[PDB]
Structure 1
Amino acid sequence: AKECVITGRKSRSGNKRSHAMNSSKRTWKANLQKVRILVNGKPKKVWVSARALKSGKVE
């Protein structure tokens, strides 16, 4: 449920590496901001990524 409501990007896993190439597990998160938009004829607060926010949505 912690994900963007437009272009629903969320966290994904991957590796953290050191010099000497030791490998460990980590995640990458999206920068979702809690913003008030019109999901219907009504406004509400939702998670929206900052990428989906630079052209098109109405705050």
Structure 2
Amino acid sequence: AKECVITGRKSRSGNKRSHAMNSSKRTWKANLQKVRILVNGKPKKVWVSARALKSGKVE
């Protein structure tokens, strides 16, 4: 699904402006590294955002 399982942050959409302000449509993805954590009592491997991983979750 490409979405952090801790905090549900995903890809969004927006403009990519230049000089003279021509508008081109781009996207802002998010840091989703693949790690192994305890989704339930039994461990598994899922996507976790880098920022949500900076403090609190075990590996």
Q: TM-score range by the shorter chain?
A: over 0.9
Higher strand share: 1
Cα shift readout 1:1-59 (whole Å, capped 9, x = no counterpart):
10100111010000000101000100000010000000111111100000110111011
Structure 1 gap ranges (5+):
none
Aligned CA RMSD, in angstroms, stands at 0.5
SS in structure 2 opposite 1:52? helix
Residues in 2 aligned to 1:35 and 1:42: alpha-carbon distance in whole angstroms: 14
Higher helix share: 2
SS in structure 1 opposite 2:5? coil
The alignment's TM-score, normalised by the length of structure 1, stands at 0.96
Q: Percent identity?
A: 100
The number of aligned residues is 59
Structure 2 gap ranges (5+):
none
Q: Give the 4+ runs in structure 1 shifted more than 3 A.
A: none
The alignment's TM-score, normalised by the length of structure 2, stands at 0.96
